[PDB]
Amino acid sequence: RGNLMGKRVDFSARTVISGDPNLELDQVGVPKSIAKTLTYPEVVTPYNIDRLTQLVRNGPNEHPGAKYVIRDSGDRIDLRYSKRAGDIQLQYGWKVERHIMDNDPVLFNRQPSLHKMSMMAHRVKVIPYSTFRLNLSVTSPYNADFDGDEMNLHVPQSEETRAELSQLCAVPLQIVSPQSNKPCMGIVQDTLCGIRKLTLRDTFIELDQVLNMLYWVPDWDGVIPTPAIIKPKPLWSGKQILSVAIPNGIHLQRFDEGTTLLSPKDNGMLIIDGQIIFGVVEKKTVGSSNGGLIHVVTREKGPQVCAKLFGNIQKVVNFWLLHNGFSTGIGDTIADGPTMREITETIAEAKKKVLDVTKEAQANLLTAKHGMTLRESFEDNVVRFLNEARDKAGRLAEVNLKDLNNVKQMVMAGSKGSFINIAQMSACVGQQSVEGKRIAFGFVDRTLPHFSKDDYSPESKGFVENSYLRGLTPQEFFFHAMGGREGLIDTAVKTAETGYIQRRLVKALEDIMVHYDNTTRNSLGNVIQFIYGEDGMDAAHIEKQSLDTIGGSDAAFEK
Amino acid sequence: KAIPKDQRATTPYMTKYERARILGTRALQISMNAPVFVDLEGETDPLRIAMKELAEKKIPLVIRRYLPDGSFEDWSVEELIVDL
Amino acid sequence: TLSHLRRTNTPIAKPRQLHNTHWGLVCPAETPEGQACGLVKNL
Amino acid sequence: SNTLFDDIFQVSEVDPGRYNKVCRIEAASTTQDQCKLTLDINVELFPVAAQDSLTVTIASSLTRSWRPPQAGDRSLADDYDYVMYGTAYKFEEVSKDLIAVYYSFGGLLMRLEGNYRNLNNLKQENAYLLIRR
Amino acid sequence: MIVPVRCFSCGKVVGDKWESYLNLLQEDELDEGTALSRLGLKRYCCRRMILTHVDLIEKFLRYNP
Amino acid sequence: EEGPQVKIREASKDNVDFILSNVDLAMANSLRRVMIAEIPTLAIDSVEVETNTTVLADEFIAHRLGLIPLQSMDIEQLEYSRDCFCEDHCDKCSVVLTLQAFGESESTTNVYSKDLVIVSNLMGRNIGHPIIQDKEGNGVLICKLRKGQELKLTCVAKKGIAKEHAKWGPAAAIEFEYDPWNKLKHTDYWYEQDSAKEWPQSKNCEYEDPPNEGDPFDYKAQADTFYMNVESVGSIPVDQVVVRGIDTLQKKVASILLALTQM
Amino acid sequence: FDMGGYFIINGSEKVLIAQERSAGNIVQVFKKAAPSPISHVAEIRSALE
Amino acid sequence: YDRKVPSPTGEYVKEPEWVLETDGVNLSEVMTVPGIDPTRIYTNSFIDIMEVLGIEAGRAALYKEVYNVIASDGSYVNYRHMALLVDVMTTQGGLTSVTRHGFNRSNTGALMRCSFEETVEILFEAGASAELDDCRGVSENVILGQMAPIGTGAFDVMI
Amino acid sequence: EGLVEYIDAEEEESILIAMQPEDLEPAEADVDPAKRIRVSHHATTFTHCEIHPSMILGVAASIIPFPDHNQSPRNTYQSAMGKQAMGVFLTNYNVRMDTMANILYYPQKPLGTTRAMEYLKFRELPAGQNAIVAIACYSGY
Amino acid sequence: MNAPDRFELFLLGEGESKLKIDPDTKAPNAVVITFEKEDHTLGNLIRAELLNDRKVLFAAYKVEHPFFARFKLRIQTTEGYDPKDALKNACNSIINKLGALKTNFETEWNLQTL
Amino acid sequence: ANWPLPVNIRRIIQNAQQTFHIDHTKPSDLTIKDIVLGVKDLQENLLVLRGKNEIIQNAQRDAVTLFCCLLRSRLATRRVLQEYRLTKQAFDWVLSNIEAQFLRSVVHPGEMVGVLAAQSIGEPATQMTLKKVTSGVPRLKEILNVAKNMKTPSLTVY
Amino acid sequence: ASRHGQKGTIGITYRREDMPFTAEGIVPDLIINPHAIPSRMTVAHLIECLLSKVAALSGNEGDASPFTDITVEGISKLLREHGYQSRGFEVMYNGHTGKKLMAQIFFGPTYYQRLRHMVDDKIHARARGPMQVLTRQPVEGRSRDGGLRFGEMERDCMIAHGAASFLKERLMEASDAFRVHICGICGLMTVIAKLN
RNA sequence: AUGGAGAGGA
Ligand SMILES: [Mg+2]
Ligand SMILES: [Zn+2]
Ligand SMILES: [Zn+2]
Ligand SMILES: [Zn+2]
């Protein structure tokens, strides 16, 4: 299980990774020094020679070069020594370990591997600086960030091993993934916070810029599109240009919760033929979503057309975004004078609602809910009395955050951030829980030696009435400290249990492949399914599609 | 056992694996300067040849498929349709 | 160097939980993740 | 290479639906009581007040990379203040003898309602909109 | 560990100003916010350059050989 | 004269505060980039250490010497060492200098840039004098020495640009602002109640008119009048950072034009 | 500033990490599981200080 | 509970019912009760179901369960994986576990089950029974360092 | 003189500790909305009041500025990291000899300090620079 | 360690010329000038000046990857105007503005004291 | 009604009333026969399982059954001509397409699915983290353990 | 990494010109994405910064002590007294163009530390080299010019994709291959290979 | 080169 099923191996490498906006989706930024070390045996062939004898000439430490040349006898000319390394006549047949080059096919990898996608194929763009670089989008299938992650890379060594890489494992071939019969790669952070930005109706772009963006899309046909506005000035809308990155025959249709072929809220999303007609672009569209633009452009146009889609949407949005810019300040976590006063009362009532329940229950007037104690239904009550207060105060803050608030903007864009992220920051942080129940009586019948015994009130049992913006008090803090920890503890234990689940899960099914009678079996020929998935189909090419026989009136059906 | 040119359930569509492995096997042979069966239209990459060799169905390999009972089916890269 | 001189080890029923009593004796924040999270502490 | 519709309108609503540079316009036609308009107007370029009356056209006329001026020495179907180019996306039966069209000048949309613009307002990629005075 | 010659961010020469900074505090006895302003360090990146610096060198000299 | 219109409004040895009238932003800007990091200067670019029994280590002083400001006035009659036909440095392209100090006193012997000493033949050029704005007359503070502590150096200074490392940066801090009350609406101001009571006026506001509410947005107006101030590290006098700034931008614009003719 | 509390062994500074254990000579009652014959248990870790 | 069900008139309309929920499991006696719809009663114990309502219906709850753990978490996994996993457990007759007691017991090649948990003993008794190895398993050709019958190596290539 | 006492958990159990000496025991009787909301004086018994809450923290934690304006787990990360934050680890690095030793070229006393950095000798031997941080999306690098 | 020298930011290497000029296959009368060893300093200002030139259809620039000092300026001009000439005048104009910016400043610097 | 199914029909439709540029005020040229009868013998070659014998062929009628409820519901005569006024050549395509787009979707023999079905279940289990039911990782742990000893057993009566 | 879990690696370096600038001529030493801010609610960071600006300006030290009455408001009222927008905002101008940034930027001094782990302590690459004695498998660790482990779990991944020849190749010509000899009879390695 | 412990990264 350690020297046969999983061996240590040659032609490998690893380094810190950093992301790269002007790198292609299927590309792997490989620093020059690694590129200098990893080889691919190439056989001397009438076609290549001239580029090959050149690669010998260059020697083993100036990029497009080589170490070792292998001959008839199968001897091994080392090119860092050898009296004949600035010489050598390349006979047909011989092998010529060469530096790994631009547009080779390499296997790129992050651990822990838990996918097909955790091992992709890439094309090697070689670069300066010591990091592997990758396209932001190739983030999810690898589960990378740049908080310090390292990544592996493996290099084929036969012509067929290369085939198998670029014909099966290549990133664009993985874009639409069998897992959730949806695609797995999207548009993230800036691109996604900027594409929303660019796109809202109020974003107008004048000539000088509209020329540069257009240039920026590599697949520009070199035809300025007519401006939406021709009047007092000519301007082009946000939507207007980005639409130049969207290839042709791409029709997309969404509609959201208020949306009527006029999108007053600029709701939803209609794309008639490579051009967007209404609605703000954002995740639901350009995400890793089901109906999304990526899902379509893949099936409709191709894999590699949609590989280069990530490229073009980014090259343009990035650029735009570079020049409008985007921040977050503690200004963005302040909320209205009255909204602060108005939030505090909104807590102060959940405060007298607990009081009044405890006041009630202590006088034995609390009815025990069926199948639970008096003690239990009072607990269940008070918790749902302070959660309904966090949410009520958090809402009351979310409603005050005007459209111009940078946090509320990444929430609309869906780049990072949630509701609760606001609720806690600007409003109040809410109850702290451990073991499932609110903060324990660790000390005899109290929580901290700063309280009396038998204090079931909100504060004493671990409600954090304050916001991260106002600041937690010493207890509030230590209570938070307790929860926080119970987190880390499972996130530590959670993941060890998991990677074991996976390990059997894998080891159980292992040998199940679809056989040439389209049947599903193991090594013995014991059938498991008689048609894979009960329908014969590969998950990659499946899609959500409404069956409009099922719903509707008996009448309206006939009609 | 056998299994004659008739009575065959096996997909007359080329499995990506079949193809990826033909494209490789040819891309092997080619790279070791075996002769090439189409006019290299300014192409010299031993693999990007084999794709042109395959788009023009001039690859003389027989995919021998295998059914669980031990029996098997032959198919030329001729009969085989490359859709993908 | 300071922190590493003030450290607690605990070998081997839920001892990772910051227990109420640690208040002002053990540091509520300082501790390693994964491995022996909440088993190792700092005064 | 010619016009496609023509009419004077009377604006009865302005909407800065949390936008600074755009507004949604709810105007009616002087003349035909089977007609109304809904349009997004760049109010930072050409301010539209309520109680205003505006003259609206279509045309499709006066497609290769947009040229700058130098047309500052060329004729231009504009004796107008404010002009837009767009695409038509839906054509709707509101039953009757009543019909509506939908325009996107890159996101600033339009709703137009009537009947004589049957044989007059094609299913087309073309469509300018010219507002004056 | 001695004054930075020149502030990082803004680029101006600050090194020549350490001595005069100490003196404007210690002897004329002004508050640090005045001393830094009198030395003409008006930008706040060129300011922190000096206020934040810690002259460790003095502890280092203290060792013998 | 014909085009762009400079009005100096505050001038010192180290600050030129000037309106610049009638220019493209594109030009008003690209001037600044050049003033930051494209006009040549001279600063230490090779240090050879003979002895260093100081607290500070070898490459740490080596580095500190770099940042030491050198009079780069006639810098334009000094060659780039990579260009010049010698081998390593010479008296056409390099200014050698020497730092010598040894502790004598019981009370911290200092090392100042004033202690540096020209050693190359200047050949009349007004070059490589450690520049000292210091009021008591001793620039920077290189290093400190104990009783028995020696340091013996030989810095060869060369010609360089802030592109090739911000030690050769001749400028420092370049203030730059246009259109005081966002008349062009080139920013959207983040506000909480009142954009204008929350965001403060920059002194530049006096020199342009109010916006007069009732006036509708000026769409066709463009970028004019750019309020700047170049500070100077002092290796080149203020005026000459701007004049040379103008010149070298002009220069490297010109060499595109030349570049065509060769083709 | 060197604050001590370590030892020097073969040139390397080794630090003794406080080992935490369960205190001796103390009474503890432990409710004991579903399938046990013993419902509660009283236990003393008895050692001479 | 809510339940989408037909109005006579056709359209699917919202018909709310009363549903009862239990701590503890005896099915052998709760469906044989009067009053309850015994065509719909459900236990989160798929291991009960199995011995009560049959292996095949056992499958459906073993899945529905796996499906709930996923989907409840926010995710969606396509049917066919959880189908295969479930099928795999279900098709030996009983509920073969995903542990050294379940799947690793079943008669499949020795070298294979060997590369899971009971590494040494698996070979011991498999070296006693004089077991013969298929050599069609993934794991084993990996161990033999040859081309394992997988995608690329499912077929065979000749002239 | 008996104004201060030594308490272990076992004994802790039988006493009532105040938090703020100040706000937690004069009389009772406006309030800048900006200041956080605190419970109250509640229960009057206090055997012995706390020295200062900040003391609940360890050597690594008392480095973090406003660590009470921070979602807990974060402080824990910062706590294992400051232990890998390059700086001056002793003034005698020249003389000492170690397999690996890194020192910052220009340590800086942070601009925002915990009151307990004073005792931690941090201002005197810091690891970190007071760098000018722009929070913005720039080129997206 | 893999980092390139800084002098690769304005010094041309072996075989590299200051500009290559290519035919843009997309449009007619259209040129894509690469610009080894320069940046936004120059590119930005030529594109913005290549615009007031009333005889120009299209002017844009772009720093492909900022690991490298290089950028592509593309210009499309009218029927008759050759883009090179559109550049030619676009630069001459810049030089003349600057030639006059200089004298004007100089004149003003001279009247001030201190 | 919303279910996973091969070949997105609606977008083959959009890509027909786009590709042939089709007006909504001019008559078709389809016979009630073209529609109805093509629809019936497109079906017949949506081949998943091939075998020419009784059992296999009865597996085929079952492996397609659910795709075809859609197929028929979207290629039904009143819908074709009234909702998306197709022409006889444009329809011939929309029919021709659907078949090629289908045949692509069939699983390739080789497709090592075990390893695939594990990871697809194992990976989103890894991203599971935190009213009284056993749920999340601990639950999934019971399930796969075939846990006799389960922490929330429960009936749900109707 | 700053001072509150907010960690990160340099992706690129921009000289002082390419960088955005405040009107008074200042530049940032460091830009970090506003995306590491809403979902770790690292809010101390944002305050710190705002406080650290006023300290550097006013010329005193900032009291970021935990349980105090120091408010973002009192800190703000302070930065206002001092000339800037009281939330750390400051109109910047894009480096390349000079064109005012449309959004204003949060911009302060922020105590920021430099952790160990620098790239060229990690950057490792192997392509042939030493083997263990026992297994003919390659030796562990980058300090011994080692090799990267094609893990059990990553062998899973190559099985998924269908890559059969690569799975074998990363398991034969990399790592160890070996040519043993077999007895047609018994079926063991007991054959005496007397090769040649 | 082998065995054995501890800290650390994602
Ligand atoms: Mg990470
Ligand atoms: Zn500064
Ligand atoms: Zn010389
Ligand atoms: Zn034998």
DSSP structure string for H3-30: -EEE-TTSSEEE-----EE-SB---TTT
Cβ count near G10 (within 10 Å): 5
Q: Tell me the shortest Cα–Cα distance from I53 to chain E, in angstroms.
A: 28
- The residue that minimises its CA distance to C1' of M1 is L133
Give distance CA L130 / C1' M2 (Å). 16
Tell the residue number behind the tokens 């004078």, with chain if given.
Answer: A337
Tell me, yes or no, whether F60 and F131 share the same domain.
yes
Peptide bond into D97 cis (omega under 30): yes
Could you give the CA distance from residue I141 to residue A191 in angstroms, rounded to a whole number?
11
Which residues put CB within 7 Å of chain M, the nucleic strand? A 111-112, 145, 147-150; C 9, 32-36, 40; I 80-81, 83-84; L 7, 117, 132-134, 139, 144
Could you give the CA distance from residue A510 to residue H137 in angstroms, rounded to a whole number?
8
Domain boundaries, chain J: 1-114
Q: Is L69 left (phi over 0), alpha (psi -120 to 50) or beta?
A: alpha
Strands L62-63 and I112-113: parallel
Tell me, yes or no, whether F29 and F69 share the same domain.
no
- Within 8 A by CB and 6+ apart from A326, the residues are A190, A193, A194, A197, A406, I136, I137, L34, L103
G-chain CB neighbours of C9 within 8 Å are 17-20
Could you give the CA distance from residue A379 to residue A389 in angstroms, rounded to a whole number?
15
Q: Tell me the shortest Cα–Cα distance from J6 to chain F, in angstroms.
A: 5
Q: What are phi and psi of F77, to 5 degrees?
A: -95, 5
Chain-chain contact of F32 with L99 (C-beta, under 8 angstroms)? no
By the 8 A CB rule, do F174 and L25 touch?
yes
Cβ count near A208 (within 10 Å): 15
Strands L21-22 and L92-93: antiparallel
Could you tell me which of F61, F40, F43, F42 has the C-alpha nearest to residue F51? F61
Measured in Å, residue J10 CA sits from the centre of ligand 3 at 20
Among partner residues I71, I77, I85, which is closest to L113 by beta-carbon distance?
I85
For residue A434, the SS3 value is: strand
- Asked if B13 reaches chain A (Cβ–Cβ under 8 Å), the answer is no
Give distance CA L136 / C1' M8 (Å). 29
Measured in Å, residue L80 CA sits from the centre of ligand 2 at 20
- Asked if A232 reaches chain B (Cβ–Cβ under 8 Å), the answer is no
Give the number of H-K residue pairs with CB atoms closer than 8 Å: 128
Task: Give all strands of the β-sheet with A527-529 in edge-to-edge order.
Answer: A513-514, A520-521, A527-529
- Within 8 A by CB and 6+ apart from A35, the residues are A63, A99, A100, A101, A124, A126
Expressed as residue numbers, the domain containing A312 is 189-324
- Within 8 A by CB and 6+ apart from K17, the residues are K84, K85, K86, K90
Among partner residues L96, L119, L123, which is closest to J40 by beta-carbon distance?
L96
For residue A513, the SS3 value is: strand
- List residues of chain E with CB under 8 Å from any CB of chain F: 2-3, 5-6, 10-13, 15-16, 18-20, 43, 46, 57-58, 60-61, 65
- The residue that minimises its CA distance to C1' of M10 is A149
> Which burial class, exposed, middle or buried, applies to A459 when counting CB atoms under 10 A from its CB (0-12, 13-18, 19+)?
buried
K-chain CB neighbours of B7 within 8 Å are 52
By the 8 A CB rule, do A387 and A379 touch?
no
Could you give the CA distance from residue H41 to residue K109 in angstroms, rounded to a whole number?
40
Tell me, yes or no, whether F183 and F102 share the same domain.
no
Give distance CA A159 / C1' M5 (Å). 46
Residue A87 annotated as binding site: no
Query: What single DSSP character describes residue A90?
Result: -
By the 8 A CB rule, do A463 and A432 touch?
yes
Tell me which chain A residue has its CA closest to the CA of residue B69. Answer: A525
Q: Which fold is adopted by the domain B1-84? A: Eukaryotic RPB6 RNA polymerase subunit (3.90.940)
Measured in Å, residue L119 CA sits from the centre of ligand 1 at 15
Q: Is C24 left (phi over 0), alpha (psi -120 to 50) or beta?
A: left
- The residue that minimises its CA distance to C1' of M8 is I84
Could you give the CA distance from residue C9 to residue L90 in angstroms, rounded to a whole number?
49
Q: What is the resolution of this structure in A?
A: 3.6
Nearest-10 crossing angle of helices B16-31, B46-55: 130
Q: Which fold is adopted by the domain J1-114? A: Gyrase A; domain 2 (3.30.1360)
Residue E60 annotated as binding site: no
Q: Determine the distance from the C-alpha atom of residue A368 to the mean position of all C-alpha atoms in its chain, rounded to a whole number.
A: 47
Number of domains in chain F: 2
Q: Determine the distance from the C-alpha atom of residue A283 to the mean position of all C-alpha atoms in its chain, rounded to a whole number.
A: 11
> Which burial class, exposed, middle or buried, applies to F105 when counting CB atoms under 10 A from its CB (0-12, 13-18, 19+)?
exposed
Nucleotide closest to C4 measured between CA and C1': M7
Strands G18-19 and C7-9: parallel
Nucleotide closest to C36 measured between CA and C1': M7
By the 8 A CB rule, do L9 and A18 touch?
yes
Could you give the CA distance from residue A267 to residue A284 in angstroms, rounded to a whole number?
11
Give distance CA A145 / C1' M4 (Å). 36
Cβ count near A183 (within 10 Å): 27
Sheet strands (E) in A179-338:
182-183, 204-206, 235-237, 252-253, 270-272, 275-278
- Within 8 A by CB and 6+ apart from A126, the residues are A30, A31, A32, A35, A63, A100, A101, A102
| CB hemisphere CA count around L54 (13 angstroms) | 25
Peptide bond into F69 cis (omega under 30): no
H-chain CB neighbours of A522 within 8 Å are 108
State which nucleotides on strand M lie below 7 Å from a protein beta carbon. 1-2, 7-10
Q: Tell me the shortest Cα–Cα distance from A277 to chain K, in angstroms.
A: 16
Expressed as residue numbers, the domain containing F172 is 1-40+167-263
By the 8 A CB rule, do F143 and F64 touch?
yes
By the 8 A CB rule, do A391 and A423 touch?
yes
Give distance CA L181 / C1' M2 (Å). 29
Q: Determine the distance from the C-alpha atom of residue D27 to the mean position of all C-alpha atoms in its chain, rounded to a whole number.
A: 11
- Asked if F111 reaches chain J (Cβ–Cβ under 8 Å), the answer is no
End-to-end CA distance of chain C: 14
CB proximity under 8 Å: J 57-86 to D: 57-58, 76, 78
Query: What single DSSP character describes residue E53?
Result: B
Which of these three, F136, F166, F196, is where a domain ends?
Answer: F166
Could you give the CA distance from residue A317 to residue A189 in angstroms, rounded to a whole number?
11
Could you tell me which of H150, L165, H146 has the C-alpha nearest to residue A157? L165
Measured in Å, residue F42 CA sits from the centre of ligand 3 at 14
For residue K40, the SS3 value is: helix
Query: What single DSSP character describes residue A446?
Result: B
Measured in Å, residue I100 CA sits from the centre of ligand 1 at 26
Q: If you write DSSP's letter for every residue of H45-88 in order, what string do you get?
A: -HHHHHHHH-HHHHHHHHHHHHHHHHHHTT----HHHHHHHHHH
Give distance CA I89 / C1' M9 (Å). 22
Could you give the CA distance from residue A320 to residue A198 in angstroms, rounded to a whole number?
7
J-chain CB neighbours of F24 within 8 Å are 45, 48-49
Measured in Å, residue A149 CA sits from the centre of ligand 1 at 5
Tell the residue number behind the tokens 């400079």, with chain if given.
Answer: F6
Chosen for mutation from F189, F190, F199, F222 (greatest number of chain A CBs closer than 10 Å) is F190
Strands D23-29 and D6-15: antiparallel
End-to-end CA distance of chain J: 48
**3+ Cβ–Cβ pairs closer than 8 Å linking K and L:** yes
Chain-chain contact of A201 with D107 (C-beta, under 8 angstroms)? yes
Burial code (b: 16+ CB inside 10 Å, e: under 16) for I43-67 equals eeebeeebeebbebbbbbbbbbbbb
**Nearest bound ligand to CA A149?**
1
Q: Tell me the shortest Cα–Cα distance from L122 to chain J, in angstroms.
A: 12
Which residue type occupies L130? P
Query: What single DSSP character describes residue A148?
Result: S
- Asked if D111 reaches chain A (Cβ–Cβ under 8 Å), the answer is yes
By the 8 A CB rule, do J21 and J31 touch?
yes
Burial code (b: 16+ CB inside 10 Å, e: under 16) for F118-135 equals bebeeeebebbbbbbebe
To the nearest 5 percent, what fractions of chain G are helix, strand and coil?
0, 30, 70
- Within 8 A by CB and 6+ apart from A418, the residues are A411, L38, L39
Which tokens hold the place of A13?
Answer: 């490498």
Expressed as residue numbers, the domain containing L196 is 131-196
Technique used to solve these coordinates? X-ray
Could you give the CA distance from residue A177 to residue A298 in angstroms, rounded to a whole number?
11
Expressed as residue numbers, the domain containing D70 is 1-133
Q: What is the CATH number of the domain that holds L168?
A: 3.90.1800.10
Could you tell me which of I94, K5, A91, D132 has the C-alpha nearest to residue E64? I94
Q: Tell me the shortest Cα–Cα distance from L157 to chain B, in angstroms.
A: 16
By the 8 A CB rule, do L137 and A12 touch?
no
Q: What torsion do the CA atoms of L50, L52, L57, L63 make, to the nearest 10 degrees?
A: 110
Tell the residue number behind the tokens 């671990």, with chain if given.
Answer: A462
- Within 8 A by CB and 6+ apart from A450, the residues are A475, I16, I17, I18, I19, I50
By the 8 A CB rule, do A176 and A295 touch?
yes
- Asked if F223 reaches chain J (Cβ–Cβ under 8 Å), the answer is no
Q: Please give the C-alpha separations between residue K82 and each of A117, F57, K16, K30, in angstroms, as whole numbers.
A: 44, 87, 15, 12
Q: What is the CATH number of the domain that holds D10?
A: 2.40.50.140
Among partner residues A22, A128, A222, which is closest to J64 by beta-carbon distance?
A22
Which residue type occupies E46? C
Could you tell me which of A530, L156, A510 has the C-alpha nearest to residue K114? A510
Number of domains in chain D: 1
By the 8 A CB rule, do A261 and A277 touch?
no
